[PDB]
Structures are given as C-alpha cells and as structure tokens.
C-alpha cells in the first residue's frame, strides 16, 4: 500500500479558477505590511446663530493575519521515492510548486469570500454577513439580485463586481426580468443590475451571488521551499511504523506564504432559505 | 490614550456628497442675508370693444435662518496637539478643514432635501408634506415614478431632478414598466423618467425618489480657523475635561459657512407604506 | 393695502405660455384686415341622353375680435405710486408689456379650447364636439388618443397638431400603448404624443388633450397706452373722500394687443369625467 | 339676391378627392363607349387510360355608362350676372370647371367604389353585396380587416388594395392587435392593410373599409362650353319677372363625361351591427 | 341558342397557377414512370466478445401513376364554327393549349395538396395525415405552423417549402406571433415558419397552412390536337350533338399529360374545424 | 418469401447526416483504451508560526469500450444471393461500409448524448446529466435555451454548442430571444449561443438539447473487414430453411472500429413536463 | 367776463411759500418707497479693567404714506382757455407748476405740524397726541415756552428749532411778565426758549407753540402730468360747470411726490384749552 510509479498531471479543474480568486474579490492596492486603515468618519452639525457644535473623527481598522501554504503531503510521501527514482513524479512535485501554491492562494481568498473558510478571520464576506444584515434570504431572482445590490449600496457605497460559485452561477444566470434581459443571453456573464460578475470557486457558496466592493489583497507572496521536517498525518511504506514522525524523510516542499485580506464596511451576500 | 504619530486617510464619499448638495436642489446664488424670490400673474380683457379690464397680481417669497458650520471638538483637539509636534499630523489638520467643508454641504443637504434637522421653513419634503400632499404611498415603480412627477407638474410646474437615496438607487433599477424597459440607474446618466436625476444620500430618506424644481443657496463658503475656545466640550480620554472647558493654545478649529434655502411650495416625494 | 417694496419681477413662468399660444391648435400667422373669409364649392350629377341638374356652393367666413388691454388698476395700485419713488416699481410696468402680452396670448389660445371670453366663433373645440362626437367620459388612454387624433382626421381633413395642457402633458406621458414601438412617453422626445403636441397652460382646459385641423391667427397691436382709469375693480390708498369711481388717477400703464381668431371646419375634443 | 365683388373658392376637400376617386380603386382604365371584359375558365379531368372530357368556356361581361357633370343651378345663376360684369367671378367660373371636374370624380366614385351613390348603371360594391355578398359585416377589428381580404380570396382568389375612406380610418385606428404591427394608419403609415392606398371623401358610405382589387373605371370626361338655354331648378330674380326655368340670357358651364364601372365580384364592405 | 361571335379571351390571373405544381413539389424529373427507392440503413451497436446481428434493408416505393389531360367538349363548340370562318377563334384554340396546360398542372397539384382532387394513387396530404397525426386541427396559429414542420422532423425529414394558398395567406397573417418582427403573409421572401414558401392556387379545401418536403415531378408534356371523336359533356339541341361521337366537328382539341407524384410521409395540411 | 434480385441501389440524404454527429462533439484521440486523469485540488493551511497542513489529490480516470460495425443478415439475406450474382448489390455492400460507419457514429453518440445504448455506460453524457441533475424542466424555450448553455459554463468550461435532434431543433426555431435576434432558426447555421449545433439522428432524444464542449472522442479507426462464415441468425431462407446461422458465404461483412468516449460532467439536456 | 382773461400775472408773496419748504427739515433727507429705519443710541459703560460688558441696540421705523398734489378747482377752468389760445398764459401755467410745487411742500408740512390732515402717522402734534403731551397751553408766556423745551429734554431729546405759525410767533417772542429772558429777534430770528427758529405758514392756533427735534424729509419730485383728462371730481363754475362729462382740455396739472416723516420719540406741542 502507497508506493507506485505512474504518470500523472492535473489540468483546468481547480488551477484555472485559483489564479483569479483574489482578483474577483477586487484587491485594490497591495500593502507591504498589514497596517492599512481608514480614518474618516465625517462629522458636522448645522445650527443658526450664537451656537458652537462639535465635530470628531478618528478611526483605525488594520488587517494582519498570515495564512500558510501547503506543507509536505501524505499522498506525496508515497511519490517522494518515485520523485527520486523517476523523472515523472519529480516534475509532478515541481508543477505542484505552482498548482498547490495556487490552491493555497485560492483558499486564502475563500476565507474572506466564505464564512466556512476560517483563516483570515473577520474579512470580506465572512465579516459582512455576521456584522450586517446584507444577505437576502430565498431564491435569487433578477429583482432580488438588484435588491442584494441595494444592501451594498446602503452603506453609502457602490458594488464593483459579484463573486459567483460553481453552482451559484447557474441559478443567477437562470433568472430573467419581466421586460429587461438581466440574464445576458449572448456571451458575457449575467449581471445583477449593471455590474459584471466574476467566477470564484467555493465550498460553502451553493446558491445566491455575493458581491464585494473595496477589500484589499496584500501578501508576502505564495512561494515554495524544499525541506526535510514537517509534522502532519503519518505515512509508512515498508518495514516501518510512524507515530511521531516529521523530520525523518522528505515528502514534499514546505511552501511558505503570508497572506492578508483587508476588512470592508459592508459587502453584499445572497443565500437560499427553506423552512 | 496618547494620540501620537498617526496617518490620516479619507474615503471616497465626501467629494460626492458635497457636489450633489446644491446641484440636485438647483440652488441659485444670491449675495444677501436670507433670501428674496418673486412671482407674478397677469389678467386678460373681455371680448366687446369699449374698455380694458386691469388688475394684475404680484407675490413675494422670503427665507429665514442660515445654518452655520460646526467647529472642531475634543477628537480633533487630540490631533492638533500632534499637529504641533509631528509633521504628518500638521497636514492632516489642514485636510481636516477641507473634509469638514465637505461635511458642511452634507449637513446642508440633510437640512435642504430632507427634514432631518430643518434649518429652513421649506425643507423640500417638509415643505411638501405640510402644505400639499404630493407624496405617493407604496413601492417604487416605473409607472408610479412618472405619476410622482405628474403630482408636482400638475400645480403649474415641471419636474427637474429626483433626489435619490442609497436604497432608492437600486430600487429605481429594479423598477420596470409594462411596455417600457426604461429606468436609468446602472448607466452613466440616471433619470426618473426622462429628465436627469441626482442622488442626495440622506439619513432621513429611506426609500423612494423625491422630485424638486427650484431652490436657493446663499452666502456659503468654507471654514475659517485660527484660535477658538470651546463651550460644551465632548468627553475624551486625552487631556483634561471640565464643565467650563476651552483652550487658549491650538486645539480647536473654527468653521464659518452659512446657507439658507427657499421653497417654491411644489415638490414631489415617494415613500413605502405597510399594508 | 400695506404697500411694500417690489424688489424683483418673475419672467420664467410667463415666458413659456406666451410663445406657444399662437402656434397651438395648428396656428397660421396669416395677415387679415378686419375679418378673414373662406369659401367652398360642390357639384353633383350623373345621367345620359336627358336633362342635366347641377349645384353650386358659396361659403362665407367672418372673424371679428377686439383687443385685450390691462391698466395698472387695483392690482398694481401699491406699485403705481411706488413707481415715482422706487426704481423697481417703475421698471416693473415697462417689463409688464411682455407680461401682459403673455396674458393677451393666454385668452386667445384658451378661446380655441373654451374660455370665459369667447371672442371667436363659439369655441374651436366646443362647436367641433357638437358637430362630431369625439370626447369619451372616464379616462384618457394611449389607444384612445390615436382614435381622438383620427376623430378630427375623419371629418374634412387630416389632423396635424394636438393641443395639450401642462397637467395633461404629464398624464399623456404616464399613458402607454399595447405595443412597445407605439408608446413614446416622457423618455423619448420632448412631446409625449406621437403627433406634434403644443403646451398651453389654461384653467379652461385642465387635463383633456384636444386636436385641431388648421386655424389662422392674426395679431397686430402696440403696448403703449396711458390714461387715468376706466374699469375700477377696487379702491386704492385710502386717504381722500369718496371711493368707487374711475375719476382722477395718479399712475396707470396700459398695454393693448388686437388679435383675431379664425374658425376651423373640423376639430377634435376630449375630456375626462368621474363615474 | 345681391352678390358682387367677393369671389374665389378655397376648395380644401376638392383638391384631394380628384386623385384617389377612380384611379386608386380601379386597376386599369381602357377608353371606350361600351367596354367589354373577358374571363376564361379552364377544364381538367384525370383518368386511367381512357378518353378525357371537360368543357371549358369563356365568359364575357360588358360595361357601358355615361355620367356627365351638369351645369350648376341656383348657385351659378346669381354668379352668371357677376361673371358678365366683374372679371373675378368670370375667372371663378372657369376655375369652377376644374372644381366640378373633381366633383364629377366624386359622383363617379360614389356609384363606382361606394355602394349606391348615384346608382350609375349598377356595378360597384352594391352589385357585390347583393349577388355574391362577400362583405362579412361586423365590428372593425384587426382580425376583421384581414377577414375582408380573406373574403376576396375565397370568392375570386385575388388580393385587394387598401380602403379609400377617411371616415373609416377613425374606426380602423381604434382597432388594437396582439402583434406589434397593430395596423392603424394615419398617424405614421399610409394604410392599415397590406397594400397602400389613399383615403377618399365619401357621401353615401358612413363607416367600414372599402377594399377592392381588380376593377375598371373607363372614362371620357371633359368640361364643356356654356350655352344660352338651360332648365333645372330655381330661377333668379331681377328687374323683369320670371318663374319658369329656361335661362335664355344667363349661362352656366356644363361638362361632357362618359364613365363606366366594371364588376369582378371582389369588393369588401364593413357595417356596424346593433340590436 | 349559343350564337357564334368574334371575341378575344383574356389570359387573366389563371396563367400564373401553372408553375405552382412543380415548384411546390421540389423533385427531379424521372426518365420514365417507374419506381423510386430509399435506404432504411443503421446497424446494431458496440460490444466486446459478442455477436454483430442483422441490419435493415432498402425499401423501394411506387413512383408510377396514371394521369390524363381532358379535351374540350361542348364549351368550345360555338368557337369551332367561328374557327373555320374567322382567324381569331382558330388562334384562340392554339393559345388555349397554354390554358389547358395550366389546368393540367392544376389537377396534379390538387392531389398532392388536397383529398378532393382525385388523380394520383395515394395522396400526399391525405394519406400522410391519416396514417400519422402531423396536420393541425382547429385554429390556425404561427406557433402551430412550426409544430407541423416538427412533426415532419420526427420522421427524419426537413421541410423545404410550405404550400401556400390565397385564402390561407390572410389567415396566417392574422395569427399572432411571439416574435417582435412578424412575417405576415408575404413581403419579399414569404415564410411560414422560417424557410421560403411558394404560393399555389387551390380551389379544393383551402384556408389552412400546408407544408411539403420532397415530392416527385414526372414527364408528361403538353397538348396534342387532332379534332376527331369526343365523349361529349353537354347534350344540347342545335349547338352540340346529342350522341357522344362528335362526327367531324373541330371542338375537341385533345390534350396529353400523364404525370405522377410520389412522396414520403412528411407533408401535412392544417384545416379549420368548428366546435 | 421471394429473394429475387432487383438490381436497384438506394442511398444519400440519410447516411450523410449521421456521420457528422459524434465527431462534431470535439475530443482528443487516444492510441489505446484509457482516459487521461487529472488531480483535484490540494489542501491548504490557515495559521502562522505553526506546522501547516499536508494533503495532495491523486488523479483517476478511465475509458474502455470496443465498438463494432455489425454484419447484416436480417435484411441482407435476399441481397447475399444478389451480391454473388449481380455487380449492383455487391457494390451496394461495399457502399454499405459508409452506411455502417454512419451507424458507428450514431451508436457512439446515442449511447453518450442520449443513453440509447450502454457503450460508454459510466462516462455517458446523458447518464452524467442525470447524475448531476442539471436538466431544465418544461418545454424548450428561449429563456430555457440560454439557461441550458449557462448550466455547463457554471460547473465547468462553456460548451460550444447544444446537441440537437432535428425535431428539437424545429421547436427551438419557433422560440426567439428578447433582443432583436432569432435563436438558431434556419438562416444558414443553427446555433444555441456560439458555435454551430450538430443535429444527431436519435431515437431516445426527441425534445430538448444537451450542451457539452469538453467531451472525449477516440477511435481505433474506420470499420472495414472481410466476410467469412455466418453468425447470429434472424432470418435466412431461399430453398431450404435454417434455424441457426453457420457455413457458406456471409451476407454482409463484420467490420472492426473500436470507439470509446470519456466525460467531464458538462451535458445538461432538457425534458418536457407532463401532468 | 367770468372765465375770460387777457393778461396773466405771477402770484404775489412767493418767498413766503418757499420758506415753508425749507422749514420742513430736522432729521436729514432720504428717498425711498416708504420710511427708512434709523438705528438706536447704543451706550457703553467703562466699569473696570478686565471684564468687558456693554450694550448695543437697533431701532426700526414703519414704512407708510406717500405725498400727493391735485388739480385746482374752478379757477383752473378759466385759465384753461387762456393757456390754449395764448402763449403767455401757457407759460404762466408752467410757472404755476413751480408755485403748486411750493404748495405741495406747504401742504405736507402744515398738516404734519397742525390739524392732522396728513396721511403720515405720528408727526409733531399727531405724535404728541398719540404718545405723550409735552406742553399745556392757555395763556402766552415766556416761562411756558422754556418749559416746552424742558419737557422734550426730560425724555432725552435736544431741540434745534421750534417751528410755529405767524400768529403764534409774536405771542411766544414777546410776553408781559416780571422778567424777560431769551428773545433775540433783531439778530436773525425770534427765539422762544433760547434758539434760532424758522416760522412756517400754516393753518394753526394762535395760542400754543410747537417744537421739533428730528423728522425725516422725503421727495419724489414735482409736476409729472401736464395734459389733463376728464374733469368731474373738482367743483367748477367759470365758463362751464363740470360735474359729469368733460372733453380733453387741460385745466390744471397733476404733480407726483412721495413723502414720509420719521416718528420721533419726543416732540413738544402745545394746545389751547378753555378755563
């Protein structure tokens, strides 16, 4: 069990959607360190004569919580000896240094886009649904999607683009208005009211389109580094038993990433509710 | 509390609120205390040739009380001490003068278009609801929006621009007529039915566009500051707080912007009512 | 009486009603001395190898209408004495030449609809409704508006222009036809109706919309006149004995305009009535 | 009694009546005193290796009628004295020859296109409605208008041109269709039907479309010279007493016209039903 | 009595009906009256370590059919005596060959389009509708016309051209269509559902949408004059012979046409039915 | 009964349409039986200054099917004696190789896209559509057609064209989009949204189109092999009766062309709702 | 002659009428439609070194009343014929306009000072009767005249000149008493209390002297309308008595002016009372 030589390559199933995950979130400006904060609150009070009204404005909301990339894998442990012996599995791990790094890049944006993904904690849509009642309950319609865009507009803002899941994109494109097109019906993605939609692969989102405005994407950069020591799930091949093993044999490259997502005031959400 | 070495940042909202205050209201400039407005009506003569019938009416309108801009409080006082010590906070104090100037029009629009803190006797919606009930009850529709414009135009007038809210912006986009697909909100130009309409973004207005013809903007400018003594004083952790608290040293920045608005006694409104 | 300063004079409202009055109801500015005449001829015969019988017609038309003039009188009584002392009241009567012109144009255009002073041959709409039925009680419809235009087109000649009030203009824009291409509304063009529509603000019409074939308008009259009262509506100033008679006046400015309205053969009529 | 100086007829209805009276309604006009039209019916019979029998016969129909425009009575009698004295009335009588020429077309169309105007040697829609019916009377609708074209195809198998009536255009425009085309005419389109035809003035027919395809209106019509003796109607009063009609001195212009209409059993007529 | 007289017969609208039969069929001319075959094709599907099993064989259909063109009877009896004395009636019988050819095409088309026309064995419209429900029963609709083509597509056959009638053209135009464009009878291309449709004169049944795929055109030729012996349709006393023998009279003018048509079960003709 | 030689060949306008069915689906050809496998996402870490997660996906995919062109005997029994004696039926069996190839393309597509056979079985497009439940309930409408194309583009890559069944193509031709453009129809090439829709002759597919772009199509080659010794009996008789097929010359040739198809869950299809 | 005049002469004692014009002066001259507001005293107190406490006040004047000068009665009618015929009397009427200008100033000053026949509310004697009486009169005395100025000084007001009638001037200057004080007379003008004062020609009582402090002068000019209309209001006797109707003949000129005197808080006035 676990240890066979065979040619394997991953293509356009998850890696294609991974590269555009944070770009769909619209990461306006990438900061060096997690210290980006908004200060303006805007204060004024109108009187008439012989009166002095006071005004105060001071705010700071910085986002800094690094999320690591994938370490040495249990499946790659059986393939590590195949990497040393054959050229096929070595090129597979070298392609993984970009493919699985993109998967770590995908899950980092998914932490903000979905509440179930916990890494950044208190960022984008994950913080939006809990703090503000922006999510519309029920079936996503052409009028309901514009009503979802109203929730993003309610906090003195405007929605840029709506992030769509693999199953949520079908339900959004199915709905069409009484007279207006709404569902595009040509080649382009179906718009909620006017703004274009971008696809983002998610595990939590199934029905309804969530829209994000201004939430920054800033990172140290998801890389790859070859190492000998990594503690995870135990793996054994022949004449060996592993219980507290980490440093003994090299399985896969311990990739390093330090990513952060800037928190927004209000971002739109949509979900199907049944009782 | 400390309050030292901080970077002040402004979000893209103050620039939009300041420009739309008088532009949506169509406030004509007048260099006088209060306001003066005129209205005239002439009479016609009979069919038979002998003598011509005279008597012609002349009516005048005036507005009172110009709302003054609010001075800086304890929040800006903590930053002004940092402005004297640090180079970065010194430019922030001058930027605070410009931000409050934008907020001065924001309070003027709240007093002008809405009845949130009425400084003038005719406050668009307050002038409508008290004198002539032209407001349409119920949900906003494309047929109902033109009918709302019909309510203002019936009393010898014409609808120029409908003041849009944050929730009303996307509510107009959702609205569509039985035959006509026109709504105008997602596009660069937004109109109620045909004639151009600008968004006001007010705390008092909840849902529904409110049309208005002519108004006034007088003697308005920007904040004048040098050295000011506070009267009431907001509660703060930094520096001493007292009942008769004022500062001789640089802490508070004074403001000077007085403006008054006149009503034509014919303006439309829209609001949702529960069945 | 009070008195008070005139300050300023309005022009904005009267300017729109003055220009559109003569062009309304398909107006023709054709020069006529005293009265204009129109004639029509008809013949009918069929037969062979026998005596022939023929017929001939000669029609006569008359249009005799007098000038519309208005003095300063009881209406501008507080401004008549104020003309000698204040600069605003003196310039008011000179500017009233264009304001009373709007009133002189107001009665001439209203005579086509109905009006109190019927200078013309009855009324261009009332005599047309008595000759041919076109008006329907209830509510004006978009399909019915095309039928109303066809109602004038059926008798004698095809209709070109449809006259409408300010309240009717907003009501016609609210109305939409069964086909998308058929309905024009407020969104497309200045005119709501399909055919050429002219705005005429009058108390006699008040939401009706009636069409006309072809009617002529001939106007000639200078606005320069000054005399010591003739009509006398109400007493002025109150300081001397005896009040009522038109004898002895301090200041009065009269403006005359002699205009004759020529009757059309066939026109349309439409009015709304509550059930 | 007493008529001088003033002359010239405007002729608003006579100008358009001459164009589409017989020219639009009928296909071709081939000049003859008694024109004859022919039609052949082909025979066909199929069988298995036997003799083929089938009688084919050609049926011909002749049309001969002379409808001349007569010299005018009563009206021209007062005008003849004015023609001899004044140059204006003499030129008016020569222009009346061209006006009566249009009236001769009006009398020809009344008994040629319309049902029973002068009843000039039968034919017209009157012959079609009595012998073969083909009218299908009812309410004027979009389905009923197509049924009029279908009635011509059911009896003779020939497509018919649009109606030449202005009073029927009012009933035609009021009709609404499920399709976007609607078919209304007058507002933008020349004709509601498939083919294009101009509306003509009707004296006998009140309401309903007069659609006819293949027809013949052969004519030899021209204005004739005025003679000394004529008797038709009322005699004119002057210095010498006269009661019996003979003219003697006064002259009225006649016309020599021979117009005939040919039938083809393909004409549409609509009539309103009320019980 | 039937008196012989010199008269030229008109070609009328019947001359265009000749080309309709072959154009609606859209089939190649076969060298002789025989048989046309079509393959059934297709074999059993995929399988490893298994038997192949049998496949379908080609099936031939009957293409040869008996037909006859009728000769002129007692209808051309008065014309035969006029042919001997005058050159006009003699040239009329030679020109009647083209008229008889139109009748010869009319009999062939009547079998393919209708059940009332009896000539060909196994009617194209009648037998196909009886064997399988392809023809629409009830009200004529634009959506129902596509449904008739869909019934033909169920048997793996695409409709090339729709068989149009003069009565059916007005019925198809009156039917409401979901599309904003709308074809309506004929404009330039004339389409029933999508592809181009040809008009055909049909006295039998009529007033219903018909569609056709591929029907055979066959060799026959035109008229062959002999002027001897006849079956005799009308008996008469002096104009025609009582006994069917014709003796030596040249009223016969024999015609030769033995054509045929064979088509697959795809063509269907809709018919109106009363509830 | 009766196995007589006819010496007649039947082909074209049936075999040509079936050949373009399976190849138009667009898939990469593979040398041996076995599909290309792709790994599905590697797991990621969430925390900083910790061990990190380690998991990688293993790729798995397979496609194995051996297709064959069937040897005919059920219909080739009479044709076997005709092939051995006459050159026409012998050349017909060689031309039947192109007919069997059409069946080989038909069986490859019908098992996948329509699930008529179980050749693909596991990797069948219709079976995958049932497993995914992406099918739209109801009639094939313009709104449903755009939703069907979007259903594939949401889950995976956007499909090129929706696979038609000719009968479904005609029903979809009746439906047209909201914008001024007809969907598919019969202009030049039928298209669902982008690329040209491939019509496939199917027994299972009748109404509703399935959209698949990334579906594999691979074959061993073309079907051509020798004929020797009888197998699988359906019908065999001429002079002596037989129960089981053995001995003598073969009726039609069994031909080898092993084809297999792999799927990636893209097809959706549409089913009509019945109550 | 009664009405007829040959030689016209200028009016005697012209300097006395001009002296009354200059007498109506105490508190400047300002031209307006009504009365202009004059600000209060506003005093300030020294108090101490550090604390700065004072007072500021503003007073307002009510805007009312304007001047008028009317046409002369009876005597003007005699002068009307003389002015029209002779150039010398016409120049005398223009010189009479300057004499009536002196009378216009005389009327406004006299009615304000005595009898209260002015339109102006609160002036000299009318101001004393409404607010507070300063001096009581019975017998003319030197001590009583000094007490009148002391009564005005008690309400904080300094008098510059005491205007009085010609009958009261001699009584105030010279009085039989024990000791005489303050008279002047020989220097420039006779004094009542101890200041130089001008006497005005007015219809006033001989017993009782009046004193003025501050009263505003206002004017709009003199002699505006020269040509007179119909005379009816004035009582005429010369040449022809006018009561009802009168032709266009100028008798006397109409003069236009506007006067309003500012109401003083303290003004001295004395009125005679019986014992």
Author numbering:
A (entry chain C), B (entry chain B), C (entry chain G), D (entry chain F), E (entry chain E), F (entry chain D), ...: 35 to 309
How did the manuscript describe this experimental structure?
80α is a typical example of a staphylococcal transducing phage, capable of transferring non-specific chromosomal or plasmid DNA at low frequency. The capsids are assembled from a major capsid protein (CP) as empty precursor procapsids into which the DNA is packaged through the portal by the phage terminase. Many SaPIs, such as SaPI1, redirect the 80α capsid assembly pathway to form capsids that are smaller than the normal phage capsids and that are thus incapable of packaging full-length phage genomes. Here, we report the structures of a mature 80α capsid made from an uncleavable version of CP at 5.2 Å resolution and of a wildtype SaPI1 mature capsid at 8.4 Å resolution.
Reasoning that empty particles would be more amenable to 3D reconstruction, since the lack of internal DNA would reduce the background noise, we chose a sample in which the majority of the capsids had ejected their DNA upon prolonged exposure at 22 °C. The reconstruction reached a final resolution of 5.2 Å by the FSC0.143 criterion. Compared to the procapsid, the mature capsid is larger and more angular and has a thinner shell. No density could be assigned for the N-terminal 30 residues of CP, including the N-terminal 14 residues that are normally cleaved from WT capsids. There are considerable differences between the CP subunit in the mature capsid compared to the procapsid, especially in the N-arm, E-loop, P-loop and part of the spine helix (α3). In the mature capsid (which has no SP), the β-strand folds underneath the E-loop that extends from the adjacent subunits, while α1 is rotated by 81° towards the outside of the capsid relative to its orientation in the procapsid. This is accompanied by a straightening of the spine helix (α3) and major changes in the preceding α2 helix and the P-loop (green in Figure 6D), presenting a concerted rotation of the subunit that leads to a disruption of the α-helical palisade seen in the procapsid. During maturation, the CP subunits are rotated from a perpendicular orientation in which the A domains protrude on the surface of the capsid, to a lateral orientation in which both A- and P-domains lie tangentially in the plane of the shell. This rotation is accompanied by a reorganization of the asymmetric, skewed hexamers to almost perfectly six-fold symmetric hexamers. We hypothesize that this rotation is triggered by the release of the N-arm from SP, thereby coupling the capsid expansion to scaffolding removal.
